[PDB]
């Protein structure tokens, strides 16, 4: 199917410390493969997936130089934005930046993006054409003017359509057994008396990859979602994910409810009923 | 690969 490479950068100002905290992470699909943390002793971009450890010293010197340069830019952006909003130098503030590219099933370029937030809300963003910007407010409008005068869209377009996409393809091939490979969910149902007149059916999907998954409850074949809970998808810590969906039911009507599971690792969708 | 050599200030 389609695949992504995304990098996430967070910078937090710290009044009374010398530098802001900067943290950078990169993913391919739902798999993390690198990190940088300004507070760690290494001061290098560091591998987090076995298949990037094979890249040589030129790769790691470059990635580290670039990611250190992003932290220096956010260090200045923190002071500029404090100024624009006339904020006290006493408070902690956040910048976040996310960019990357998607690629289709043919591995050709689908889309590219670049978003920037201040204190958890949209500040500036590249539109889908990769030639223009959306700005949230008058401070962002000033940056927009700056970035238009400096031709930042052109630089980024070239990276997103060239470099981003190419190295994504390259990471897909190296680590094929990790990234391309699919773990179907291991499933089961539990049952709980919640009262004297009611009972919970909980449908589990365990140990799957990737994380996209759809869990639904039908009653007598009729998709329905009243007194349903589906928990947020969660990492197991091994590179796999977990999720459940629950329904509260009249005591006795157990057999009438069915749990449907869709995951690209399943040949055909799975159906489950409470067994006894 | 990250974008480089570097981004521009806001």
């Amino acid at each position, epitope marked *: 199917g389609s695949h992504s490479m995304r990098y996430f950068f967070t910078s937090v100002s710290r009044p009374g410390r010398g530098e802001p905290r900067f943290i950078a992470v990169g993913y391919v699909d739902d798999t993390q493969f690198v990190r940088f943390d300004s507070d760690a002793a290494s001061q290098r971009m560091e591998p987090r997936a076995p298949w990037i450890e094979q890249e040589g010293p030129e790769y790691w010197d*470059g990635e580290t*130089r*670039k990611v*250190k*340069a992003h932290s*220096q830019t956010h*260090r*200045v952006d923190l002071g500029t934005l404090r100024g624009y909003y006339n904020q006290s130098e006493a408070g902690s503030h956040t910048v976040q930046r996310m960019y990357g590219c998607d690629v289709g099933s043919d591995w050709r370029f689908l889309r590219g993006y670049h978003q920037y937030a201040y204190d958890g809300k949209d500040y500036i963003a590249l539109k889908e054409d990769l030639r223009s910007w959306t700005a949230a407010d008058m401070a962002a409008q000033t940056t927009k003017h700056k970035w238009e*005068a*400096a*031709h930042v869209a052109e*630089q980024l377009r*070239a*990276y997103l359509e060239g*470099t981003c996409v190419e190295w994504l393809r390259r990471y897909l091939e190296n680590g094929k057994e990790t990234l391309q490979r699919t773990d179907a969910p291991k499933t089961h149902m539990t049952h709980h008396a919640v009262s004297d007149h009611e009972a919970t059916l909980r449908c589990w999907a365990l140990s799957f990859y990737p994380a996209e998954i759809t869990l639904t409850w039908q009653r007598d074949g009729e998709d329905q979602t009243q007194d349903t809970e589906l928990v947020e998808t969660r990492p197991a810590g091994d590179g796999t994910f977990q999720k459940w969906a629950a329904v509260v039911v009249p005591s006795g009507q157990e057999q009438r409810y069915t749990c449907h599971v869709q995951h690209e690792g399943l040949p055909k969708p799975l159906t489950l009923r409470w067994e006894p | 690969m990250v974008w*480089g*050599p*570097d981004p*521009l*200030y806001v």
Partner: T-cell receptor
Amino acid sequence: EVEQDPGPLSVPEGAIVSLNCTYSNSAFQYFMWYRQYSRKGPELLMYTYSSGNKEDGRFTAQVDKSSKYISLFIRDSQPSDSATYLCAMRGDSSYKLIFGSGTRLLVRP
Amino acid sequence: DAGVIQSPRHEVTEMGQQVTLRCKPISGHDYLFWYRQTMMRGLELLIYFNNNVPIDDSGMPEDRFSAKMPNASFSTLKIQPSEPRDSAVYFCASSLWEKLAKNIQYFGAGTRLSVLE
């Protein structure tokens, strides 16, 4: 690494001059030409990103990324074009420029 | 309208002594580059700085050479001890991101250094 023939090139006023450079590293994406007068700093003339051709008055710069070959043409050369011409390039991970060793050009009045 | 200012413009010195080269970038510029040119004929980057932090120093000789930028208007390149093979013209340049994106940088007039046997 960058290869540039040192010359010296001696041409008559009005002549078209051709300077060029080869490289090996396919990560280079920006290509520049500089001129330098005797005992002075280098002055940028033309710059190119990725591939193609660029005209500015008497100068045309060209880049063929597949042959890894780049060129500068000077139409209607003049006595004041006499200088050393250097090519330089970089990729996208650093502002570090790599230079060729330069070509000395005399244009005879 | 001042450009980059380099000092001294000329330096003649006996090997074994300390040599100091200085550069004042154009004010407002946050990138500063030190290059070297010997009549082994072309330029080579020694180091560049951004916001006074050194960014790439792969061209720095492994010994005797040290560059600093103690504030945004002043950088120093020092050689202790100097040797004849260090004779060169040393150029300083400064720029900004948006000029560097079209590969423009602004060059000092250079320091011409002769270290003598």
